Ligand binder design. Structure first.
Ligand code: CLA
Ligand code: CLA
Ligand code: CLA
Ligand code: CLA
Ligand code: CLA
Ligand code: CLA
Ligand code: CLA
Ligand code: CLA
Ligand code: BCR
Ligand code: BCR
Ligand code: SF4
Ligand code: SF4
Ligand code: SF4
Lengths: 172, 80, 731, 51, 173, 32, 70, 26
């Protein structure tokens, strides 16, 4: 459980919430009343990014007719600025019911029918979660230089591994 | 209620009491002087802080000393 | 009984000064009832959110009223002849001649010409349309609501900071230098290079197409390779037209110096390389201090270890750190000293080096922006000494400060004040004495007998900066020197063309009228510090009153005894300086305005003839330039200057009302109120009415403050009325 | 209508409502407020003298 | 109970003295009980007319009658400033009857006189049904003014207008 | 467009008069 | 003047001057790991690596404003 | 009133979060 076999900093090194990996070099894992909030915010930044990554590489094998930066504004059922108060109500309505009590994923509006996963399946969802967040920031940096498409950087790097890389685009 | 605190540099010449226009000061026995007396301020509730006491003390760096505190209806000198 | 919730000693006060002191020591947090030091820092920290949320609501107000009631989209196209608009007028007290006399600038209804000059700042940072200004207003209105909610939440007991969070001077100064100064300036060069550089070249970079427009045609390739001169290849030419692409150029970080030819402003490209360069330095200087990672400098070992041998500076700076970290008035006094000098540095470097396009052509903007940040600098600088004088009473500890440089200040404190009192007395003798000598020689018809000392020591500096009007041929006026020859491709030919132009404010040519007035400024600087440093040093006591520290900072007196002690306190030693401050900043702004009026009219000899003697200050600057001001309304009619004509008499009225609280003192007035109490308590049918707070006269310290405020508001409104209307009246 | 304190506080405030929300549109008299008029002849000149 | 929104508490003055403490007082305007006697009837009487007002127009928009914005300025007989002398002085007699009913005895709404409750109405679950119909009737009238100010057509056919296009045709104008 | 004839009598006659009142009745409260 | 040699060698220079020379003069919640013999952890390396890069970018920039005038 | 009602319907959810902030802090 070391990031490198040199050190193991926190007093939260033993205390876990089934998502421990042992790395805190800046000091944001030491206030004991707030790790009930750090671990949930790390979870929820992952869970809203898991559904993202499923709907980013999903339209790579699927439809190419949607673009990426225009995908936020196309001709929808409602107008894109008009469908926003549906988003302010419906997203928040499940969000508040998720917030209730914060009793370590209390099944109030996200009841799972079963499946609880008290062993390492909890840690694997964290490791899938801590890599889905790196996935989205991958999807919105290397695309975000207006160069690569929905997703064509991997298909380029399978073609040119030692060719097309980070220090080899250097254009528009 | 002004804060009047006097000090051991008093010689007991009681000129502060005679100068006080509000009977804040009185003379108490004390052995640290020839006149066997040192002032006292039992009536600082009635003091206005007009500092006629410490215009009258002879001692260098005045023995009586008035600190202007929080002002009630008697400290502001009010007939109304 | 309830209103001073902070001071229960004021809640037991049955008189009407309960209202006045509920207001004035409400932000004196160190003297509230039950205040602790953890409770001290939390109310200060939330109040700084309150100041920030006001500033951003204020600035979003400027963005709104310009976008709605202003003519920014009309002023973009013609930025010389079209006058700017601040905000439209709805005064239902107006008459019909006062509606049509204030309709100007091509607008519909009555308007105010904005002399604050936020158009020139916005036009050069890329604002072109009103739709770009509403977005900025709604943005800052959101950000102002963020800081309102932040100051609320950082008082809530879950989110109250610990006491050791505030005293971490390492981590703050490491974050504010690198993040708040470095990253912010790094991000501002991001606004310049991406947006504000190509907007002047006639290319709209909005939020829609900023991820499509390359700022440079071969962008990010010189930064990753190394040839950074590729960013300065084809700059804005000498025939560039600001706002269009006519002779545009493609460079993003040029290092030219001097001015743009059309706007006579600074180039946008070297303003980008400017804020990039100090961003690199502030980030590098933001990795100096030891916070949490084992590297860095400890402040507790840099002060104490710089003690010179042979007793030059006592015990050195030993022990200052616990008197800077624990004391707030020391930290506030340093900050007001620093900000108050780099507020003048803002003012001194924006008339000579105007940074925004078509500034130093709009003359009333230039007059307001200099005079504003000089009085703002004047008030902040005298508060540095004020909160420096509060430090010696409320926070100074001699046992903690045995023998350091701070106690040696109090040790030789009479040598400080007497040598200031010599410099102030020498300057006042020999500056006034020369003006009176010159005035008598004007009165006896013989101007040749004047004392006209040429400013050699400053003309030597201008010639060293490249002004060949005087012919010292020294360094940059010397064409065969070294410093001239080390920079002929680097930064000099823009700078040397910009000084030797006679019609900008870059190093104005000076004569003996400028000898006399800089010594008058030096008089006013040395005398204002004489009053203030005496107010700091003698805050703890004098021979007249050796226990001044026992009363506090702001007390009335110590009685009529010991000869009489009117104005003995360090507050009363601070307030006398505000008169000598407003005098001094009045002298720097008279001299700035009148040398610039004679520059902009063209009669540059009308200053140098008349500035050498004090009648020319009166009959050629105050008498002559107030011709169209006081004619703002007359029985013939009225014009656009009548709002500045009215304020000019309004300013004289507040000023003279200030003498009522300054010449008449309290005790004439307390007896007068005692007759009014009688005449109220004996009048039939008004005995139905009775007060709650007893009417007493304004206290001694209050009469200082109320009189100084009427002095200062009427001072400011008088000169600002004369400044705006004499400039814009003829311009 | 009103006899207590808080009833009078409502009626003064609502009478201040009923005047001001009308005063902006219907209550701006043709002779009283010359700002609530039409754009008359001229005025939109430069500040005079020079620039 | 679910007052108006989850999680939040009802403030201390909403103790069910008025039936249905639905927790909706963010400006704390139910503290003074002398005013709270009036604000009960303010929630009644602003809905007592507006219930029959909104049904009275939704019956008669597209039948035989013009817009209620133009129903007032229609050319009737014996011009309505003379009818205002009727239609103020007659309804002031009704307020004069009810003036001894505000303060002394018998809070209005649930009085149940013999010609005014001829069928003998009853207790709870019939007080809420009169309550709930009054809320959205008040919400109707500040809709119908704003439906006619934004869309000049008829408020019956605005329902068919929203069913013609739920996406673009909205309030969002 | 009708804004500068409405917000100015609010802020200048009405909203200050509320602040003339509420910030006066607060002054002479007898503290419990 | 070279793009890849100068910035590499300058950082190689200044990660050797604090590694072999300025070792003791610099030395006058557990992240400090002395697994090199006198404490050359990532905090110390990124301090001498910021000096190694920045002077190397200074050399490549001075070599490219058409040439030197020193 | 497009951006007026959309900001108002945004302010509804913003006030509902403010009811979460007005309780979870104390
Ligand atoms: C920058 C503007 C600003 C900010 C952030 C605050 C902030 C605060 N004021 Mg203050 N205040 C201000 C301007 C400001 N005030 C002005 C202009 C006045 C009139 C002179 C007052 C008069 C005032 C009073 C009378 C009181 C406050 C109080 C408070 C606190 C609540 C808070 C610290 C209260 C306080 O600190 O009590 C604990 C309080 O009693 N303020
Ligand atoms: C990198 C992280 C970071 C950042 C960005 C900030 C940022 C800030 N902190 Mg801060 N802080 C931090 C970490 C950080 N903090 C940490 C870790 C601690 C704990 C140790 C603190 C403890 C702390 C306290 C206790 C306080 C702040 C305050 C502030 C604010 C400064 C006041 C202000 O706006 O003046 C910024 C000033 C300027 C931008 C002007 C100076 C810049 C130059 C030199 C002047 C001339 C150029 C000028 C910009 C040109 C203007 C042109 C045009 C804009 C007109 C600011 C928001 C204060 C505050 O307001 O509370 C919120 C405050 O009281 N902080
Ligand atoms: C020091 C940093 C800085 C500052 C003060 C500004 C200031 C401004 N920019 Mg700008 N900009 C910057 C950096 C900066 N920029 C950088 C680095 C880029 C490159 C991506 C841009 C790109 C850019 C564009 C493309 C445009 C502006 C525009 C504007 C103007 C209005 C802002 C706006 O539209 O709000 C709306 C803001 C947004 C829609 C998103 C802002 C992004 C986040 C919210 C900012 C985070 C900052 C944070 C909240 C502030 C700290 C307080 C808290 C801790 C204003 C002059 C606009 C304009 O009128 O210029 C002509 C415009 O069209 N800027
Ligand atoms: C913190 C400020 C800031 C921010 C947020 C950005 C952001 C960006 N810059 Mg940028 N830039 C900045 C400062 C900044 N820059 C500075 C200071 C310079 C001058 C040295 C440049 C010079 C620059 C160039 C030359 C280019 C970018 C580009 C970019 C974009 C893609 C970068 C990958 C992105 C919008 C590139 C781009 O795609 O343009 C949109 C591009 O070609 N920038
Ligand atoms: C960073 C800025 C800053 C901060 C935080 C403080 C903070 C403080 N100062 Mg300080 N001060 C400052 C700048 C600052 N000062 C400057 C720049 C000066 C020089 C002008 C002073 C001079 C000064 C003195 C002399 C004293 C303080 C005191 C205080 C403390 C009490 C606060 C108080 O009295 O507020 C209450 C403030 C007011 C009620 C305002 C009074 C009225 C002013 C003059 C505004 C009038 C403007 C007028 C109404 C304009 C309208 C005109 C109309 C026609 C439009 C507090 C710690 C006092 C202290 O600590 O006591 C020991 C004290 O004696 N300060
Ligand atoms: C125009 C008004 C005015 C003038 C002339 C002065 C002058 C002075 N003030 Mg200032 N002062 C003023 C207004 C003024 N003040 C106001 C309004 C305030 C606010 C209350 C203050 C507050 C103030 C403070 C708090 C301090 C001063 C100080 C000083 C002295 C500065 C040293 C100097 O320049 O000496 C030069 C003086 C002169 C040139 C005046 C002398 C005139 C001639 C030369 C005398 C001989 C002429 C003639 C023979 C006499 C005829 C009399 C008889 C024979 C008929 C000087 C006496 C400081 C001080 O004492 O420094 C030493 C100081 O600490 N003043
Ligand atoms: C202490 C008094 C004093 C002060 C504060 C100033 C202040 C100033 N002078 Mg100045 N000056 C003074 C006396 C003073 N002068 C005297 C006595 C003369 C000779 C007539 C001049 C001649 C002079 C010239 C020619 C110029 C200035 C200028 C300036 C300004 C820039 C600073 C500079 O050039 O350094 C000048 C510094 C000095 C001259 C040092 C004087 C300090 C000594 C101790 C004063 C006593 C002189 C006396 C002969 C010696 C007697 C010994 C006695 C101490 C026992 C500045 C406002 C320049 C200017 O116009 O700015 C725009 C400029 O060009 N000064
Ligand atoms: C900044 C806010 C403001 C505004 C919007 C006004 C508006 C007006 N003032 Mg005024 N005034 C103000 C501040 C203000 N004043 C201040 C601060 C002073 C003290 C210096 C004055 C002193 C002043 C004088 C001395 C006079 C005015 C007059 C007027 C009227 C201009 C003549 C025309 O209309 C004329 C229109 C009418 C006569 C029709 C009657 C309209 C009234 C006002 C409606 C009543 C309102 C409502 C029932 C009560 C107010 C609500 C309450 C909560 C306060 C106009 C109503 C003149 C006037 O006639 O007063 C009305 C006048 O003689 N003002
Ligand atoms: C009372 C007191 C106080 C206060 C103080 C103050 C207020 C101060 C101020 C101060 C100041 C206000 C200072 C100033 C300074 C300045 C300086 C010292 C300057 C210098 C300059 C220089 C150094 C320059 C240089 C140069 C030149 C020559 C030019 C060109 C560029 C260069 C850079 C080269 C306190 C709070 C602490 C507390 C205690 C006591
Ligand atoms: C494994 C090992 C080894 C090796 C080691 C090494 C080799 C290390 C290195 C390291 C390194 C190699 C480091 C580096 C670092 C660096 C850094 C950390 C940087 C930073 C940077 C910066 C800070 C920059 C900035 C900038 C930019 C961005 C650009 C432009 C310029 C400027 C400055 C602005 C050996 C074999 C010996 C032994 C065994 C172990
Ligand atoms: S102070 Fe002077 S007067 Fe007062 S008692 Fe001591 S000696 Fe007598
Ligand atoms: S303070 Fe005034 S009253 Fe009290 S003793 Fe001294 S003089 Fe007499
Ligand atoms: S009151 Fe005026 S006169 Fe009497 S002492 Fe205090 S200051 Fe001197």
């Amino acid at each position: 459980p070391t990031w490198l076999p040199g050190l193991n900093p926190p007093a939260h090194l033993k205390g876990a919430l089934a998502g421990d990996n042992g790395f805190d070099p800046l000091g944001l894992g030491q206030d004991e009343g707030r790790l009930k909030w750090y671990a949930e915010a790390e979870k929820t930044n992952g869970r809203w990014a898991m559904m993202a990554v499923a709907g980013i590489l999903g339209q790579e094998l699927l439809g190419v007719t949607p673009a990426w930066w225009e995908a936020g504004a196309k001709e929808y059922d409602i107008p894109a600025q008009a469908l926003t108060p549906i988003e302010f109500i419906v997203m928040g309505f499940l969000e508040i019911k998720r917030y209730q009590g914060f009793k370590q994923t209390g099944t109030s509006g996200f009841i799972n029918s079963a499946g609880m996963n008290s062993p390492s399946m909890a840690t694997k969802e964290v490791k899938n979660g801590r890599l889905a967040m790196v996935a989205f920031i991958g999807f919105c940096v290397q695309a975000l230089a207006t160069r690569t498409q929905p997703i064509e950087g991997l298909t380029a790097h399978l073609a040119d591994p030692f060719g097309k890389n980070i220090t080899y685009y250097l254009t528009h | 209620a002004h804060i009047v605190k006097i000090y051991d540099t008093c010689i007991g010449c009681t000129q502060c009491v005679r100068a006080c226009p509000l009977d804040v000061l009185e003379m108490v026995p004390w052995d640290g002087c020839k006149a066997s007396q040192m002032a006292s301020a039992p009536r600082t509730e009635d003091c206005v802080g007009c500092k006629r006491c410490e215009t009258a003390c002879p001692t260098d760096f005045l023995s009586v000393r008035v600190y202007l505190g929080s002002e009630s209806t008697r400290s502001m000198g009010l007939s109304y | 009984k309830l209103f001073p919730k902070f001071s229960q000693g004021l809640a037991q006060d049955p008189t009407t000064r309960r209202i006045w002191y509920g207001l004035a020591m409400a932000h004196d947090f160190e003297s509230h009832d039950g205040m602790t030091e953890e409770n001290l820092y939390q109310k200060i920290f939330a109040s700084h959110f309150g100041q920030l949320s006001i500033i951003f609501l204020w600035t979003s107000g400027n963005l709104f009223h310009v976008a709605w009631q202003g003519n920014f989209e009309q002023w973009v196209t013609d930025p010389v002849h079209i006058r700017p608009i601040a905000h439209a007028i709805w005064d239902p007290h107006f008459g019909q001649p006062a509606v049509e006399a204030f309709t100007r600038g091509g607008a519909s209804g009555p308007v105010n010409i904005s002399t604050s000059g936020v158009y020139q700042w916005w036009y050069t940072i890329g604002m072109r349309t009103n739709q770009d200004l509403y977005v900025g207003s709604v943005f800052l209105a959101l950000v102002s609501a963020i800081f309102l909610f932040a100051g609320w939440l950082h008082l809530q007991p879950n989110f109250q900071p610990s006491l050791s969070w505030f005293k971490d001077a390492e981590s703050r100064l490491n974050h504010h230098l690198s993040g708040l100064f470095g990253v912010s300036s790094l991000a501002w060069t991001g606004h310049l290079v991406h947006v504000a550089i190509p907007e002047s070249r006639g290319q709209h970079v909005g939020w829609d197409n900023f991820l499509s427009v390359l700022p440079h045609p071969q962008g990010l390739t010189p930064f990753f390779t190394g040839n950074w001169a590729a960013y300065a290849q084809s700059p804005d030419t000498a025939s560039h037209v600001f706002g269009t692409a006519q002779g545009s150029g493609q460079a993003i970080l040029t290092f030219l110096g001097g001015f743009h030819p059309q706007t006579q402003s600074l180039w946008l490209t070297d303003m980008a390389h400017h804020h990039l360069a100090i961003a690199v330095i502030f980030i590098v200087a933001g990795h100096m201090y030891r916070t949490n990672f084992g590297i860095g400098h400890r402040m507790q070992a840099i002060l104490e270890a710089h003690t010179p041998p042979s007793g030059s500076l006592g015990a050195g700076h030993k022990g200052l750190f616990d008197t800077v970290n624990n004391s707030l008035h020391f930290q506030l006094g340093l900050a007001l000293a620093s900000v108050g000098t780099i507020t003048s540095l803002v003012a001194q470097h924006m008339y000579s080096l105007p940074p925004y396009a078509f500034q130093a052509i709009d003359f009333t903007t230039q007059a307001a922006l200099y005079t504003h940040h000089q009085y703002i600098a004047g008030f902040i600088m005298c508060g540095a000494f004020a909160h420096g004088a509060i430090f010696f009473i409320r926070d100074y500890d001699p046992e903690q400060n045995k023998g350091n440089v701070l106690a040696r200040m109090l040790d030789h404190k009479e040598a400080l004040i007497s040598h200031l009192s010599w410099v102030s007395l020498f300057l006042g003798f020999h500056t006034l004495g020369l003006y009176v000598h010159n005035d008598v020689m004007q009165a006896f018809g013989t101007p040749e007998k004047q004392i006209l000392i040429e400013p050699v020591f400053a003309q030597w500096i201008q010639a060293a900066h490249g002004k060949a009007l005087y012919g010292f041929d020294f360094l940059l006026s010397s064409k065969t020197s070294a410093a001239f020859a080390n920079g002929q491709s680097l930064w000099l030919p823009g700078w040397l063309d910009a000084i030797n132009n006679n019609q900008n404010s870059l190093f104005l040519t000076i004569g003996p009228g400028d000898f006399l007035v800089h010594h008058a400024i030096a008089l006013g600087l040395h005398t204002t510090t004489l009053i203030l440093v005496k107010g700091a040093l003698d805050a703890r006591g004098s021979k007249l009153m050796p226990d001044k520290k026992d009363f506090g900072y702001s007390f009335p007196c110590d009685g009529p005894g010991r000869g009489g002690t009117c104005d003995i306190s360090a507050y009363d030693a601070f307030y006398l300086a505000v008169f000598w401050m407003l005098n001094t900043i009045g002298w720097v702004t008279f001299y700035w305005h009148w040398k610039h009026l004679t520059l902009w009219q063209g009669n540059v000899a009308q200053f140098d003839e008349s500035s050498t003697y004090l009648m020319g200050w009166l009959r050629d600057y105050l008498w002559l330039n107030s011709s169209q001001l006081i004619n703002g309304y007359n029985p013939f009619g009225m014009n656009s200057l009548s709002v500045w004509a009215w304020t000019f008499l309004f300013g004289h009225l507040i000023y003279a009302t200030g003498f009522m609280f300054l010449i008449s003192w309290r005790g004439y007035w307390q007896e007068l109120i005692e007759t009014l109490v009688w005449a109220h308590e004996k009048t039939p049918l008004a005995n139905l009415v009775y007060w709650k707070d007893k009417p007493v006269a304004l206290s001694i310290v209050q009469a200082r403050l109320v009189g100084l405020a009427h002095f200062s508001v009427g001072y400011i409104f008088t000169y600002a009325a004369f400044l705006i209307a004499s400039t814009s009246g003829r311009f | 209508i009103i006899s207590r304190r808080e009833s009078l506080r409502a009626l003064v405030a609502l009478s201040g409502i009923a005047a001001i929300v009308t005063y902006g549109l219907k209550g701006a008299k043709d002779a009283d407020l010359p700002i609530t008029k039409g754009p008359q002849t001229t005025g939109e000149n430069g500040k005079g003298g020079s620039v | 109970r679910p007052m108006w929104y989850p999680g939040a508490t009802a403030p201390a003055h909403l103790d069910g003295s008025m039936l249905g403490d639905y927790g909706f007082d963010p400006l704390r305007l139910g503290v003074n009980k002398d005013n709270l006697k009036w604000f009960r009837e303010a929630e009644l009487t602003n809905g007592r007319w507006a219930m029959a007002a909104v049904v009275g127009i939704l019956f008669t928009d597209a039948v035989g009658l013009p817009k209620f914005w133009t129903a007032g300025a229609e050319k009737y007989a014996l011009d309505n400033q003379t009818l205002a002398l009727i239609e103020v002085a007659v309804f002031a007699v009704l307020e004069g009857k009810r003036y001894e009913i505000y303060k002394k005895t018998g809070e209005t709404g649930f009085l149940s006189f013999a010609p005014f409750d001829p069928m003998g109405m009853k207790s709870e679950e019939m007080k809420l049904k009169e309550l709930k119909n009054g809320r959205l009737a008040m919400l109707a009238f500040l809709g119908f003014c704003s439906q006619a100010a934004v869309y000049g057509k008829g408020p019956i056919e605005t329902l068919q207008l929203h069913l013609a296009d739920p996406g673009h045709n909205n309030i969002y104008t | 467009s009708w804004a500068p004839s409405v917000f100015v009598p609010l802020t200048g006659l009405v909203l200050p008069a509320i602040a003339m009142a509420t910030l006066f009745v607060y002054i002479e409260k007898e503290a419990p | 003047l070279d793009p890849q040699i100068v910035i590499s060698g300058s950082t190689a220079a200044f990660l050797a001057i604090g590694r072999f020379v300025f070792l003791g003069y610099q030395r006058r919640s557990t992240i400090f790991a002395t697994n090199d013999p006198a404490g050359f952890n990532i905090i110390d390396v990124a301090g001498w690596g910021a000096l190694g890069h920045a002077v190397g970018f200074a050399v490549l920039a001075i070599n490219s404003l058409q040439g030197a005038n020193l | 009133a497009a951006a007026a009602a959309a900001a108002a319907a945004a302010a509804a959810a913003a006030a509902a979060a403010a009811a979460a902030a007005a309780a979870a802090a104390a």
